Symmetry: D2
Subunit: 215 residues, 4 copies
């Protein structure tokens, strides 16, 4: 399908509209721009950080993957984190989850999808680790809960990386945030895990899970 | 869902696919990593590719690099930045692989060339994944693209790497390498 | 080739499968990594498992931990050793997962228990790989085992985790965890 | 098949034979034993480092994988290397390849084997990178050449890890070796890549490839 010739023209048009409306827009942006935020979010299509954040363009370093994971031994995301933290000196990392997430839904289904199964086993381990809380919930309320739990677990993993622990240890400023977005209701205000230290991580995480385990 | 494109780009901050392609909301299924890599053994990127192809039946995968890429500059620099260097080794391999062509070059043009070559190499890798191949093998419609966004002017540039089959992957991959290695402007 | 076992053990130096099992030469197809892990997303270990199962049709996979495992001690210690800590986080998860049982324990017994639990968890992971499951699904003969070699006396100890099907994996995994969490000696 | 009850009895028997023949054998071994070598070798079954090296027991830290790879972004092997080098202070790493290797043979075939395909693409990239040298060789001599090349490439990768480069930089003693074993002829004496530094790596590697590109 010839969606491609259309995509290019739209780029062209957009780039023209930006120049004519601000001549030095690309000059300003192309140069010496240092992001102060990292966004770890889902590859799903209605959860773009460009859409969800109000940040100045060039402020956001971005990684996206299926179900917004920080797997302890994932070279890809750990590299984004380490480059962001050690080299770019970013001081805030955001893990953003969302409702109606395909990854969460696929983690919860038993379809053999090959490779993606291996990746989602991490989510399934998280589902089993909160089996009680989820089991005593209504089948179709569960995806929403798992999403919320997942963010909290991934932030926990983030805060336990060698990279984050060291930064904190040597007194570099670094705060982690875990939010959850809903397509209709927007950002669920009762979510926010938030950490600036290992001690704060623990409290924020624990509290977050307790809060979620309310009836 | 039904987005129509998987966009594989760099994590670098000026280069938002949504903004840049200016499409309807929800068109883009997205992966971003440092220097837009597709690495044969990276569950992360591959899982995105597989979700895209087998679950969402996306028909277009775009790999888009960009000018002025910090990843590429780090890949070119002999300087220890830590864990990230091992990730960039794949690109540094590519640097040295085409070291004769890049050697010829005026040093301030080398980052632009390595950016271009890197896109073509990553598409060559995408195209060799079991994921992409099986989809071709069994008749699914699937095209791969390799472009470069220029941060100085907002413009996507085709690199003329495009594949709809294993055979056409070979053809255009070779062509692009030859084109870049031999020709001059 | 035709070895009959895949042995997945630790890289630690006293614990050579060949020496210890005292088998005919060429019986063992082998993977070793730090703390004998099977990680859902580790191409390295998984590729070994797949070669074993699909190419060589090996019928027995052994996961063998051992007493006195440096990996396990590092996993238990709150101390930054670098890159390796991220690898050991998987085990540290397990430590904290069974933290109540291990909490009860006399501190010089905790490494032995975590060693045991770790074997059972890793088998639970092996057993959940698409590789193992498809082989079961389609009728191939395949059994998984979880033992611990005791470096103090040279003796393999069964941990009673054994699976020949997804269903029997559940059964013995649960049993072993219950057995270890509840009972006392 | 009941190979398992047999395996246990053989362990038992072996352990008894060792005690009765040396009472304090296991005491001596179980304790405070620090390896001075790391062996990276193939999972294939007739290439055990216990068999191939004459080292004292407890001297060898061991990793084995399909086709003895050091992939730049492989968390598993990089962890073995980093633990060996930074924590255990090992001063020699050996990458051992071998002839009649299944990995090499599978890399060279076009069977879809699923996951293992992804892993072997690394080898296939190495096959293509020496396409000339291999192509002008006789089809059934090629596996043997690819094995030999592979060792040299993996040692090259090893020596370019952040881990090895740093060790060298801060002046820690560390030497890398690449050997190739043949089931009949034994260790091919013309192989030995050997490096104690980045400068030596380069020379040894380059020379090794040139040497191999002789007619
Ligand atoms: Zn999602
Ligand atoms: Zn970039
Ligand atoms: Zn161990
Ligand atoms: Zn082999």
């Amino acid at each position: 399908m010839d969606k491609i010739k259309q995509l290019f023209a739209n780029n062209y048009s957009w780039a023209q509209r930006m120049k004519e409306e601000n001549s030095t827009y690309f000059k300003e942006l192309a140069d010496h721009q240092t992001p102060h935020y990292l966004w770890i979010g889902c590859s799903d299509s209605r959860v773009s950080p460009e859409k969800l954040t109000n940040l100045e363009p060039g402020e956001l370093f971005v990684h996206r993957n299926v179900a917004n994971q920080v797997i302890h031994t994932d070279f890809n995301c750990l590299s984004v984190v380490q480059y962001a933290v050690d080299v770019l000196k970013i001081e805030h990392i955001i893990i953003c989850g969302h409702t109606n997430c395909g990854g969460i839904h696929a983690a919860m289904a038993d379809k053999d999808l090959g490779l993606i199964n291996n990746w989602l086993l991490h989510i399934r381990d998280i589902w089993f680790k909160h089996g009680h809380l989820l089991g005593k919930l209504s089948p179709e309320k569960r995806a929403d809960m798992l999403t919320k739990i997942n963010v909290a677990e991934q932030v926990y993993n983030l805060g336990r990386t060698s990279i984050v622990k060291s930064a904190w240890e040597r007194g570099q400023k670094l705060s982690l945030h875990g939010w959850v977005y809903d397509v209709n209701d927007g950002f669920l205000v009762d979510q926010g895990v938030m950490a600036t230290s290992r001690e704060t991580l623990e409290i924020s995480y624990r509290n977050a899970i307790a809060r979620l385990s309310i009836l």
